[PDB]
């Protein structure tokens, strides 16, 4: 119950900010019929918007992160060798830069 109430907090703040009473009645001019229709459509689309069980999410994530590594460039080390050093630590840095406020 705590996880289910919790994991939609960004959604619920957005939804409340959009459907505040003053804003909807001053700019949107609904009917009772249209109000019920838009609520039913919103919840139906959200139920259609769940993660499907059984996806190979890590595989899809892998291919997604793998695609733009072919379009790379080569101061501060950037590009492919910096990505390889970060992903493949290597207790060694080549750029010991630290930021201080």
């Amino acid at each position: 119950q705590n996880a289910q109430r919790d994991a939609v907090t960004l959604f619920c703040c957005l939804l409340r900010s959009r459907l505040a009473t003053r804003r909807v009645l001053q700019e949107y001019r609904l009917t009772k019929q249209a109000f019920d229709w838009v609520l039913s459509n919103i919840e139906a689309q959200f139920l259609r918007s769940v993660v499907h069980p059984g996806e190979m999410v890590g595989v899809l994530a892998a291919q997604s992160i793998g695609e733009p590594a072919t379009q790379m460039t080569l101061k501060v080390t950037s590009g492919v060798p910096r990505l390889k050093e970060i992903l493949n630590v290597a207790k060694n840095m080549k750029t010991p830069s630290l930021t201080v406020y």
């Binding site: 059984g54 996806e55 190979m56 595989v59 899809l60 892998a62 291919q63």
Partner: protein
């Protein structure tokens, strides 16, 4: 035609695993072997005309199962037991 690693990856990403299975069997080896899981070995002879499935080295005549397999996987397996290795059971035993 070559079927490759990345092709297998994106087929996994689609998740058409029954297609993956039937492609990798029927367009390839489609082999059959009898085994003895009491051995766990490869060695079971089969007089198929007389329904005789003697297991020398295990002397049992009840532990007799056929599985469908890669001839690729058998090439691996007979090679590996020549390389001083692999038992192959037939059901789970741990939960």
């Amino acid at each position: 035609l070559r079927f490759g690693e990345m092709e297998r990856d994106c087929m996994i990403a689609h998740g058409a695993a029954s297609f993956l299975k039937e492609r990798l069997m029927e367009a390839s080896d489609a082999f059959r072997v009898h085994i003895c899981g009491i051995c766990g070995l490869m060695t079971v002879i089969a007089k198929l005309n007389h329904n005789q499935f003697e297991c020398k080295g295990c002397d049992n005549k009840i532990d007799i199962y056929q599985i469908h397999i890669p001839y690729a996987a058998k090439l691996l397996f007979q090679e590996l037991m020549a390389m001083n290795i692999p038992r192959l059971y037939t059901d789970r035993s741990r939960d």
